[PDB]
């Protein structure tokens, strides 16, 4: 089997991407944030504290003839941005772009933190990291990909995120029309539960490539590119007036600037992030100070190849017995 679904930016800045997902019988369609940096499929629901729902579409298990309470199971998760959610668990039929999993754990939120409430466009998350990170207790549950894998034509999914435009998540096949050149594959460590790999270096604009190992994660659920302070300083030093602002919480730059590109290495291959991808607009409405899309990972404890990086590439998440990651230009 295969599946193919379009993923759409939630706003004009590509702060996140939503993909429609069918849950239950008859189908209830929710727009979920596909997140290769976590492993829980959770939704706003009829059980979510009413004051914490503000415009989201909810899953109502009592209206699904295939929903079953997973008795005794609970879940609770906290994300790198400080947000969180928790609740109980149902199993139900879940379909993405024509690909159907029966008996998928659907984690129903009883509580969500303010940032989820305040974002009316995201109805929940669909985790695509390794199932060892799933938070369901006392019986850990499998991700949608893990459950689908054996049925797929090939044990892969691909992320093709757009810049200020829709893109595609495919399951079970590689669309050879969706990228240019060849796909370069690189080793993955699953020891922390993430799609963790090592970039071979970087360049700033038309500058020379610096060969240096940068361990990090491929994370579709993080907006920006978070790299070591040395790398980030070298980038922003090429933008007149750019500076790190403690008050704002990162590098800012004059909105009048034209930003240089940023290149990262995948083996002997190179992915180029155009400068415009690195512009996240005014820090506050009407400001002439703009927020940078490349930020320091210092004090995160891990480097994160988030959407800024991933949307410059066609990315293969290869869930074969030994997982790997593939990157192509597009």
Report what the structure shows:
The protein is mainly beta and 330 residues long. It has 2 domains: 5-174, Cathepsin D, subunit A, domain 1; 175-330, Beta Barrel (Cathepsin D, subunit A, domain 1). It has helices at residues 114-117, 144-148, 229-236, 307-310, and strands at 3-9, 17-23, 28-35, 41-43, 68-78, 84-96, 99-112, 124-127, 156-160, 167-171, 184-187, 196-204, 210-218, 225-227, 243-245, 250-254, 262-266, 269-273, 279-282, 289-292, 294-296, 303-305, 314-318, 324-328. It catalyses: Hydrolysis of proteins with specificity similar to that of pepsin A, prefers hydrophobic residues at P1 and P1', but does not cleave 14-Ala-|-Leu-15 in the B chain of insulin or Z-Glu-Tyr. Clots milk. This is Endothiapepsin.
CATH topology of the largest domain: Cathepsin D, subunit A, domain 1
Going by CATH, the homologous superfamily of the largest domain would be: Acid Proteases
Give the radius of gyration.
20 Å
* Class from secondary-structure proportions: mainly beta
Order of helices and strands: EEEEEEEHEHEEEEEEHEEEEEEEEHEE
Walk across the major sheet and give the strand order.
18-17-12-13-22-14-21
Going by CATH, the architecture of the largest domain would be Beta Barrel
GO biological process, one term: proteolysis
Catalytic activity: Hydrolysis of proteins with specificity similar to that of pepsin A, prefers hydrophobic residues at P1 and P1', but does not cleave 14-Ala-|-Leu-15 in the B chain of insulin or Z-Glu-Tyr. Clots milk
Domain Peptidase A1: 17-328
Keywords: Aspartyl protease, Disulfide bond, Hydrolase, Protease, Signal, Zymogen
